Amino acid sequence: RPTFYRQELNKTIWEVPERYQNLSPVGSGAYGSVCAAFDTKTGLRVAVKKLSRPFQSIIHAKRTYRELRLLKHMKHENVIGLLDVFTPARSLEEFNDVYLVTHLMGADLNNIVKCQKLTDDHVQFLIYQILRGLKYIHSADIIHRDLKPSNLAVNEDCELKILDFGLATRWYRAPEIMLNWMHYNQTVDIWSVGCIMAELLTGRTLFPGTDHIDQLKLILRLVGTPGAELLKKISSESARNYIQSLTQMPKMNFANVFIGANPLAVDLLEKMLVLDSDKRITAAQALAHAYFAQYHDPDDEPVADPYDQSFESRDLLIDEWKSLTYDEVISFVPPP
């Protein structure tokens, strides 16, 4: 029902509702392309993404559905959310293009830090928001699995949002991800938070590995070689035999590694950067840690509605994924 207009951008004809004005390209790639625009109806600067080849194949179609389902479900201040989704198509029969709209973002966490130490109050505020968003994401039984500064948008008021992309590196990955362990815990993301927090406090990458093996080597130097209780949980014969032939290394004294840091920050890092993922602090537990006393509000750290991910196991035809995607476009309700 909106009146659309057509304009050539990023070498295709974009067709968008007239509320979105002054489109200008900001990025592109195999996924599609993104324009900045001004949403006259809300007064917001927005990013409009036109998906590329959304229904070219079964895998493309399922990926399009997955992305729209995820963005429609995420409704939290510290997670990317969907302002709008539209298609110029008037029916399923002519449905070929998908456009997604969110807040225009212009800076990530790297841009805020610039290889400098942040003040402790500033670190508390940033890590607090990451953990608040992760509590929400994990409560939907979602694991990010590649959390890193480039996936963290931050505006001029230092308001932070978790993204599942970077704005137009393995240094933050949990060691079990590096080792193709599978059976991943949600605390793989807590490992990443610990790496980010350490860098914010010191102004230096915690584990700047040159390659995969070097990354693991640096990790074991800080946290020590696996202990007896962790070794009991390793089913891989080859992993055990390699680990048992390592020269033992104690866990370093984090208080001496992070000299000059808030001792409550050091305590929290010790609970995030644990090799055994079962012994890592959760996002909800971390929010209650004394380090965040000035920001923690147990009544404003919400959890997500249940997220039905059963579609992940299904093998459907292109036109079925396409019709399911069309249903999700039609049923979209814009946020307050």
Ligand SMILES: COc1ccc(OC)c(CCC(=O)Nc2cc(-c3c(-c4ccc(F)cc4)nc(/N=N/c4ccc(F)cc4)n3C)ccn2)c1
């Ligand atoms: C670093 O400092 C900067 C300084 C100046 C700048 O300007 C030139 C910029 C760029 C501004 C910008 O890019 N802003 C922006 C982008 C997106 C967005 C969406 C997006 C998502 C959902 C929507 F509803 C709408 C857009 N998708 C995306 N990429 N997707 C990908 C990516 C990689 C993959 F491998 C796969 C997919 N991006 C980058 C969202 C919001 N703001 C940065």
Ligand SMILES: CCCCCCCCO[C@@H]1O[C@H](CO)[C@@H](O)[C@H](O)[C@H]1O
């Ligand atoms: C200067 C450019 C302004 C673009 C405003 C786009 C508003 C898009 O929205 C339109 O606004 C009209 C205003 O009379 C309404 O009557 C239409 O129903 C509405 O769809």
Ligand SMILES: CCCCCCCCO[C@@H]1O[C@H](CO)[C@@H](O)[C@H](O)[C@H]1O
């Ligand atoms: C809504 C954005 C925050 C939650 C993101 C959950 C992502 C679940 O899937 C994630 O998709 C990301 C994009 O493909 C990938 O970077 C991650 O590796 C993948 O695990």
Ligand SMILES: CCCCCCCCO[C@@H]1O[C@H](CO)[C@@H](O)[C@H](O)[C@H]1O
């Ligand atoms: C030499 C490098 C050793 C890395 C050990 C990483 C141990 C991570 O921890 C393991 O994560 C698994 C899920 O991924 C869980 O099933 C295990 O119970 C847990 O111990």
